[PDB]
Amino acid sequence: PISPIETVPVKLKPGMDGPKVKQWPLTEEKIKALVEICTEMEKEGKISKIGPENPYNTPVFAIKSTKWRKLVDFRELNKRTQDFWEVQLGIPHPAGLKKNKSVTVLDVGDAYFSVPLDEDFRKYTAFTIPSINNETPGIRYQYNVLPQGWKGSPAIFQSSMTKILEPFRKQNPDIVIYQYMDDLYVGSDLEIGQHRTKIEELRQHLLRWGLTTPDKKHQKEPPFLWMGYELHPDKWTVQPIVLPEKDSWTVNDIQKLVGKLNWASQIYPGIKVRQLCKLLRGTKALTEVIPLTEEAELELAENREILKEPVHGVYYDPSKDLIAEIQKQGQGQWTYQIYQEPFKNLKTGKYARMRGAHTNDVKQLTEAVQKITTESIVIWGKTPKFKLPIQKETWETWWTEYWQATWIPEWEFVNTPPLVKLWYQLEKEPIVGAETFYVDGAANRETKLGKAGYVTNRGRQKVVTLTDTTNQKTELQAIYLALQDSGLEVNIVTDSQYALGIIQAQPDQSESELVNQIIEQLIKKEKVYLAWVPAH
Template sequence: MVTLENPWAYPQNTQLKMLVDTGADVTCIPLRMWPKNWPTDQGGSLTGVGGNAKAYRSRFALKLTLHDPDAKQHDQKFLMGATGTAASEIRAIPLKWKSDDPIWTDQWPLTSEKLEAAQKIVARELEQGHLEPSNSPWNSPIFVILKKTKDSYRLLHDLRRINQQMCDFGQLQPGLPVLTALPENWPTMAVDIKDCFFSIPLHSRDRERFAFTVPSVNKQEPARRYQWTVLPQGMKNSPAICQRVVADAIAPVRTQHAAGVMIHYVDDILMAAPSAEGLQEMAADLRRCLAAASLAINEAKVQKGPGIKFLGAEIGHSQIKPLPITLNPDVRTLHDAQALVGSLQWLQNMVPITPSQMQPLYEMLKGRNPWEEKRLTAEAKETLKNISEMLSHPSVQRWDPADKITLYPVLNRQGGMAVLGQGQPERMRVIWWVTPTRPAGAFVPHSSLLARMITKGRKTCISAFAREPDAIALPFKKGTDAQTETFAAAMAMAMEGFPGEIQHLPHLQPLRHLDIIEVGGPARVLPTPKPGNTVFTDASSKTQTAAVAWQENGEWKEATFRAADVSVQYLEAKAVEMALRMFPDDHLNITTDSIFTYNLVRQMATQGWAGTPIATMLEDALQARTGTVCITHVRSHSKIPGYYQEGNAEADKAAGRVMTLREARDLHEWLHVGAKALAKTCHIPISEARGVVATCPYCCRRPLQEGGTNVRGLMANQVWQTDFTLCQRLRPDPWLAVTVDTYSGMIVATQHRKTTSRAAQKHWAYAIAVLGLPQTIKTDNGSAFTSASTEGWAQRWGIKIIHGIPYNSTGQAIVERANRTLKQKIDVLGEGEGIPEHSAIPREKQTEILQKALYALNHHLRGENSHEPVAKHWGGTSPTEGPEVQVKNPATGEWETGWRLLTQGRGYAAVASAEGGPEAARWVPTRWVKPLLRKIEAHRNSSDT
């Protein structure tokens, strides 16, 4: 009589009367004796005396008990029907596919060395039965890489497109196991299953999808094609199938050795038992079960404690510490920063890395593109230094099943974390650090953070140690306001169903290094108003102004704040923040028409974690107060009369009073004109216009002021200056032909591929159509201006061309300055469009930006001029003789008379002799001219007489 036990079915056991050969590989029983509810798999077809019979095999290994005093228990898989199929055959798990359409990716060429290595690897795997010849319509490329030892190659199969067509298996083991769940001082052993993937068959109907081609040199022979018969490396479901197969194979060991601990992760197995003898028995049974499933242990990787290295940790008798890792401080890009932070995430359960310590590293993750430049800050370097020191010391202990587990939730400035510990609080042994929770949302009260950490700590304890914490130590004193009022609802949810003891340890010394903050305190934001000062807040998106209004001695007072390029939500919150900083020691009633700010401040009744700049701004203002606050919401522009609407109207009026300033800012963002042009066009003070220009991130770097002295015309179209200048922002037509009228300062520019005579003539024809016909054009002596073709063109138009020396300030300074001004304006407008500095402007935008630059320069005030260039060009008159002046003769140094002043500017003046008239004007520096006082003195003498 024997008893078969199957813990994965119902009924779990059955008794049979049969003859058992305990040394046989396969034991067969009739199908009629097999319980109907016990799962089976196909076992093949068997041939016996009576003919062929279909055979089945038990899906799980069964426990067999012989009812005889001398019998021993052993595990064995059974077949039903007749002997013929090996019991060690592993059931192949079929894959599910999104489509049956073949995928073919061509094999790329391989060098002779790599091709030879691939052929050797394929021949070896073919001999071992891991590959078979293929005629599949699927194909994926292969390649080989050197192993870490640099003495051999490994074969890699690119299955990315195949994986996209494959359905995912569900997660069998999400996350890593908690290694401190190993009881302390229990002997441990770690084993690795040898070639686990290659020991598990691939379902026959799925094999053709994993075919590949081994090419030949120069196509000298037909390529050889193969397909995998076992789980291939790189197939996304291989780890899940491996986990399932190994879990089924070792299930009897778990049942038989229920007193021990077995941690299985993919193909790694860690065992612990109360005694060394029990561990040896467990290991022996494990070998037997794995062998029954055609799996083998890699003897070279068997580890016995202490000092076992498993899943990135080193396991001692009572302590566990992470294995040393290399923290790369050479961070250059956002991708490097992400890799660095990712390498630290899994350490947080074994090393007390607080959220505040990680904050400098989290700040480096801000960005959108992986190639963005990043550098470690001083705070980040200090964090890495501290973490490196902590890695060298054991930080978590293996647990004692006989001792109580206490959950210690704590809060700090950057969030919350919790500790699972054993022993007295003063000498607490940490068995697990519950991963810090980084709150989500604009503001999270400390009560919610504490509740989250309690809930997460309870779940972690149940998951890892299969029981609730025996006690929870709350970080505040019993009977405080935090416990009885503010935290009541959140704590009730977190503690729901907790069967253990609740302790109050607000001054837990072993955890002081975590930058713990005290929890509790009275409410600072009240739900109802109280007697005190009342203020009204409002903001305007048009004027980008936040305003606060209040009454003082019967008169309305106001305070405003202006900021460019911020959201209206920020301005609404800024107005409330300004109000919070008023009357800090008294109760304050705030009235706002922003429902967003109203709800946010109401959430801040007690201290908490601020997760956005707006919430941080309001939290800082609340912490700076000693008086309480009540915030009230009213509808804006309501027709209901009353005090609230009167105050809201005053705040609204204060916020919308600077419309012209907003218009000036919009005009500058569009054309980037100077302060003087803004002041005149938008009717604002010059000081505010300069402030607009100063806040522009593009214009504040470039001086747009004009200056210098040069000979110029005394009327429009009298003298032009023309030059070619290179503007790389306008590639592939980077040459600008620039003409400036020296009287009005009006600029005309055209874009060209090369600096040729034809380009110069084409540019002048366009300039004549815009400005009119000039009398004289001054250029440098470049070939485009001195060629016979250009001379002939000028004669036909009746224009006189004067040549100077390139970049000579005495002849071409006006156009050189115009070149600089125009290119600076193009740069500013380009950056304003979001085009990076020094990058080429897209061709479809080049014409628009060039014309916008010319419009901004010609139709708005520029430099020290009192009129726009276009107005001066078309509205100017010929100069008349002005007052008599004295002019210094540079040769003799004497002051000569007989001159009259025609015009003057910044540093220059035009004078003409009494006989010559305006046509014979002479340009001199201003310091060489002074008024003639002779007639004034004579007039005074005659008056005295």
């Protein structure tokens, strides 16, 4: 019983033509199985025996209930079919599920094969059952329904479904039906029996359109298995992630491991993979065996212990506040937890140290907020009220003066050290009395030889001859000198267009050691006034 569902208009890509690949040869055995199968599918109404009026052909295969099944390779036909509106690529995050009294999962079953093919288009799907060891004329057919493996099947199926449910969702506003691939996660707040009845209604609505569905016979029971998660009636939890103990760890092994650990970092507090990753240094092959260092053996242990902790979460209740709190776990690394009621976390996660060319903590804080906001908008259609380890004063002082448009939605301070601050602030005006170094560097970009010295008003002088430098390291090195060689108060003038950079962004972390060295130095002074003057 297929379907009184109106077909979808499928056309071949711009001006191309249906596939014409030759039928792969098969054994009398495999053949006899395919004949069997197609004879069944012939009657279920799924395929139709056609004839000579079809130049099109796709290769059928026989793979093994250990019973013989079939596989049609549409690879060609697909690359020659039109493009469809991409089917849902974003998958629901449990934390975004509103807690319901009951939820039912209904996998639609004989999904594709159950829906009509555009009768025009069927011809292109014709394949052929070989004859006994490549001697002439065997059985020929084509598809009357979405073929398993064809490009438009998923999108077409999704649609048809969506259509069939429009009514139900209309007549049952307080019922919720999530759609995902071939599944319907149906949840409500009715009573166990009311719910049970409404499900049977749905099911029967679908059956009246060609979609078979589970009964309490086959229909999944919680906890629900769903992408590293266990879905319970009042909480979700992460499904156990097991680190196998071995005495021989290949490169492949340590990588797959580092990976599962990194994923774990999102949920579990304390995972670390520094010494593990350390094992990858110099590796000559995925199959290479690399002995774990002591340090390595240890963190792996500690991780085995963190991982055996019961982290769990709650579901979303639209009536309560959304609150995201951020912590700075190491330079550029951030952790966040998003909840409604304290300690009852809806979701957590961390953002890896984003090794940049040059930023500062307030900038990165800002960015973690941006990420969380988008994440939140997606998951809940709202944006969290923030709890950030940063003083409104520091924020105002920074943002209020940064060359770039920046922003943090509504948030509030929370003193959970370490706090994000500004490591230093360049002076707004020259420092009276404070020394005035006139810095400079020049390097033969070609020879990578240079010097970078300074001369202060006070007489003090210097210059260093450098090996390996593009003027930019000299320049900066110039400035670096001027910083080490002065008091806790200095005025440095330069022609460096790049230093001008620092001025406007006062970075507190960079890609280059140099900038780092300078930064370290900047932080030590009590006052620094950086000034730029045109070069020459």
